[PDB]
Amino acid sequence: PTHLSVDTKFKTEGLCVDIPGIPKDMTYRRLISMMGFKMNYQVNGYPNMFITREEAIRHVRAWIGFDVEGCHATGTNLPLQLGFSTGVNLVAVPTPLMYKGLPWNVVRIKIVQMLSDTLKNLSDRVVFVLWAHGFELTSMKYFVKIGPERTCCLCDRRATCFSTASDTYACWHHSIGFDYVYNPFMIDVQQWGFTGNLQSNHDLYCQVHGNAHVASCDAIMTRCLAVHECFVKRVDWTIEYPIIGDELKINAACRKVQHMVVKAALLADKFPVLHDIGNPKAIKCVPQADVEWKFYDAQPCSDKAYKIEELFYSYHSDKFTDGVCLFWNCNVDRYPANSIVCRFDTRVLSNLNLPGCDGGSLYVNKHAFHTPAFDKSAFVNLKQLPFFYYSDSPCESHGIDYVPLKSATCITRCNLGGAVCRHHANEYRLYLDAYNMMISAGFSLWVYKQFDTYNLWNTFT
Ligand SMILES: CC(=O)Nc1cccc(NC(N)=O)c1
Ligand SMILES: CC(=O)Nc1cccc(NC(N)=O)c1
Numbered sequence: 001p002t003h004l005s006v007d008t009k010f011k012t013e014g015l016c017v018d019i020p021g022i023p024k025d026m027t028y029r030r031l032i033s034m035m036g037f038k039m040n041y042q043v044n045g046y047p048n049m050f051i052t053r054e055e056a057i058r059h060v061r062a063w064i065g066f067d068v069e070g071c072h073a074t075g076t077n078l079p080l081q082l083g084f085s086t087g088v089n090l091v092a093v094p095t096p097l098m099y100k101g102l103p104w105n106v107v108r109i110k111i112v113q114m115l116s117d118t119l120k121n122l123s124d125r126v127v128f129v130l131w132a133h134g135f136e137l138t139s140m141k142y143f144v145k146i147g148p149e150r151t152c153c154l155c156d157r158r159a160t161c162f163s164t165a166s167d168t169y170a171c172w173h174h175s176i177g178f179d180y181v182y183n184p185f186m187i188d189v190q191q192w193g194f195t196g197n198l199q200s201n202h203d204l205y206c207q208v209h210g211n212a213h214v215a216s217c218d219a220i221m222t223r224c225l226a227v228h229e230c231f232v233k234r235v236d237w238t239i240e241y242p243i244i245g246d247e248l249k250i251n252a253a254c255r256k257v258q259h260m261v262v263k264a265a266l267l268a269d270k271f272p273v274l275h276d277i278g279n280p281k282a283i284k285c286v287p288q289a290d291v292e293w294k295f296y297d298a299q300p301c302s303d304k305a306y307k308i309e310e311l312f313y314s315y316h317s318d319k320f321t322d323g324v325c326l327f328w329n330c331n332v333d334r335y336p337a338n339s340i341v342c343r344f345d346t347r348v349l350s351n352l353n354l355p356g357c358d359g360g361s362l363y364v365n366k367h368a369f370h371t372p373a374f375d376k377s378a379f380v381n382l383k384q385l386p387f388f389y390y391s392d393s394p395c396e397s398h399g400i401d402y403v404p405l406k407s408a409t410c411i412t413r414c415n416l417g418g419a420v421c422r423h424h425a426n427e428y429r430l431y432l433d434a435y436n437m438m439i440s441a442g443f444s445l446w447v448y449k450q451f452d453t454y455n456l457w458n459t460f461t
């Protein structure tokens with residue numbers, strides 16, 4: 001057992017209002033057959049359209065909530081409303097963005113374009129995330145083809161689309177003009193064992209996604225509940241995720257900014273103790289610094305921000321009021337005034353940051369971190385940390401091509417002396433790039449209000 005056996009049982013109670021009379025005794029094999037697909041006793045990399053929870057979790061970047069509603073109602077084929085967690089609603093006729101009624105042959109083209117544009121920078125596949133009541137599963141034959149695992153007609157990537165026009169296969173990158181989703185995956189969240197309907201289960205955990213009673217709304221709620229179950233209530237930091245973007249540069253930048261900012265604060269205000277609050281694996285980011293370095297363990301909160309009352313009180317320099325507190329992606333309700341803070345802004349648009357549960361976002365960079373909603377009120381005792389570069393390293397090249405650097409924010413012996421040296425200019429520009437990377441990836445930096453870079457100039461005399 002690595003994949004989901006097609007001979008696994010499927011609970012059909014969810015299905016029986018769109019599909020009256022459905023057998024109680026039902027496997028994936030009989031269900032895939034009922035959906036009009038033929039698995040043609042095939043050992044070719046696609047053993048089941050349906051996947052385990054573990055497989056879905058490994059493919060979270062591929063998740064698209066999908067819901068279909070009998071627009072007209074339950075011989076008599078009537079219009080269907082197709083909703084996706086992208087906020088798209090399509091109406092298919094048999095003849096919160098809301099499109100007029102069109103035949104399947106044009107609806108299927110729009111489905112490929114939408115999935116391709118959403119997923120090409122995210123994933124090698126699609127995982128349709130369902131709260132299955134019947135119409136979603138019986139609609140698939142009209143826009144899905146299955147068969148052996150194939151590759152793109154223009155690259156090495158696995159095929160995700162098929163064209164009836166040209167009888168060829170494409171990935172998400174190369175699918176323009178393709179009309180069928182090829183070898184999609186799917187998970188029915190109702191199989192996980194809930195009481196009561198989607199809204200009632202979704203609304204236990206999340207107040208940000210309403211019900212307009214359109215299909216896209218159920219599609220979003222279904223994916224939200226799935227993220228809640230797999231990344232909020234349950235958490236797995238062993239699971240690794242592929243590089244799809246600037247992960248490595250962002251992580252390098254984060255290390256360089258943390259060392260820079262913490263080193264500068266210790267030099268400027270000479271705190272006798274630093275309280276390092278957060279990752280239990282955390283290492284001294286300024287190993288040479290005089291200070292008393294005291295660590296406090298807190299795993300990433302994935303549900304609600306930690307309450308400062310529980311982190312601190314219940315009895316350590318015990319006095320967290322002594323020296324400075326370092327919260328480096330340790331998300332709390334309200335930072336103390338004597339803090340250095342890095343806080344991920346869940347609202348940022350990137351390929352690393354997926355929509356999450358209850359205003360939170362799912363930040364996927366090597367591991368998946370469901371991050372509680374960014375809240376500006378957490379930072380009331382602090383101010384934004386302005387950009388600066390600080391170095392006491394000697395002015396000395398070794399081994400670029402130069403416009404001489406002029407900057408008020410290049411805090412070096414050489415800038416003090418009137419003229420930035422070439423070494424410090426190269427380092428400044430590398431640091432500014434790293435900084436810009438980290439910010440644009442969605443990290444925000446906050447500091448105690450007395451922090452002033454003017455105090456760093458006298459650390460050279
Ligand atoms: C009760 C009812 O509408 N049934 C049904 C079943 C399958 C497809 C469709 N319609 C379609 N536009 O494909 C309708
Ligand atoms: C990168 C991100 O957004 N999340 C993250 C990463 C490492 C540690 C923590 N938090 C902790 N309290 O250990 C959170």
Ligand SMILES: [Zn+2]
Pocket residue numbers: 152153154155156157170171172173174
């Ligand atoms: Zn391709």
Ligand SMILES: [Zn+2]
Pocket residue numbers: 202206207208209220221224225357358
């Ligand atoms: Zn929600």
Ligand SMILES: [Zn+2]
Pocket residue numbers: 394395396412413414415420421422423424
């Ligand atoms: Zn210099």
